[PDB]
Amino acid sequence: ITGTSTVGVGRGVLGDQKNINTTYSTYYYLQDNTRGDGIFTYDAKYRTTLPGSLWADADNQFFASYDAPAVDAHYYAGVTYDYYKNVHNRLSYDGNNAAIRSSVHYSQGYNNAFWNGSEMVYGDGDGQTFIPLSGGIDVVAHELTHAVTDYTAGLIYQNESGAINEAISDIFGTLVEFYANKNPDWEIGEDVYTPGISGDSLRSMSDPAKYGDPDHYSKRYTGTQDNGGVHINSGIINKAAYLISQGGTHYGVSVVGIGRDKLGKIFYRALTQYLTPTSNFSQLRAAAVQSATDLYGSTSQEVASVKQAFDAVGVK
Ligand SMILES: [Ca+2]
Ligand SMILES: [Ca+2]
Ligand SMILES: [Ca+2]
Ligand SMILES: [Ca+2]
Ligand SMILES: [Zn+2]
């Protein structure tokens, strides 16, 4: 819509108050003109037709319970845009300030969120397994990172390349959670998963086997479920990324941690310069070693730690 940029106020899924960028033109819409070609949030009104209607509100105050998932999808898309621009000098997911569109209230009792190739889509959850999924900053940033992957490396969504695509979304979802400093951890989806249960999450990067996902290449899933295990075998890469950042000893191999900012620099370079659509885990190891070599030198501690971490999870 064409109108005047302004700022409204609302409450997210977890009850927290935040300011959000809106546009006024008769109604106040969830349209943020301050970031790139804009961030746009739509109401899918419990249907599956997309994108639905651009969110309109009469008074620029978003404190109704129906408003909460829209406030968090719109705010956390802006945080994710700021992480990519400020940390990696990337404007939006295509590198040319493409508009970011999200729809909330998709379907009824839908326990997932996804990037569909054109926009982000969030279900409200069934209220038992999940609460509205845009309430998790690591979920929002995981889905927007699929758009970054699609416009760069183009990893196909099956088998080892699919597991790399999912691990890259959990890696950068976690790095955005630390950037925003929103109670950060190395778990995925803990703010919106099982509201009646404390302490759990969908997946863990620090210990994937807590929920039964593999933490070594010898334990990889080789069947056909889940597109060849794309959400299961991502645990192998997630554990290597956790070891590169934090360090530790895993299956008797010791890794010196180099921290989160270098982890993000190495994997963003690997994703944007060296990975291709059909890259497998061994090629990811080579791309991450070449990226660390480019940035820090072939005899750096950073290169050593990348090698040790892939040796610890059995990826040669
Ligand atoms: Ca209102
Ligand atoms: Ca957290
Ligand atoms: Ca998390
Ligand atoms: Ca829980
Ligand atoms: Zn994903």
Curated annotation (Swiss-Prot):
It is found in: Secreted. Ca(2+) 2 binds at residues 138, 177, 185, 187, 190. Keywords: Calcium, Hydrolase, Metal-binding, Metalloprotease, Protease, Secreted, Signal, Zinc, Zymogen. Ca(2+) 3 binds at residues 177, 183, 185, 190. It catalyses: Preferential cleavage: Xaa-|-Leu > Xaa-|-Phe. One of its GO terms (molecular function) is metal ion binding. Its main location: secreted. Its EC number is 3.4.24.27. The active site is at 143, 231 (proton donor). Thermostable. Zn(2+) binds at residues 142, 146, 166. Ca(2+) 4 binds at residues 193-194, 197, 200. Belongs to the peptidase M4 family. Extracellular zinc metalloprotease. This is Thermolysin. It comes from Bacillus thermoproteolyticus. The gene is npr. The chain holds residues 233 to 548 of 548 of the full protein.
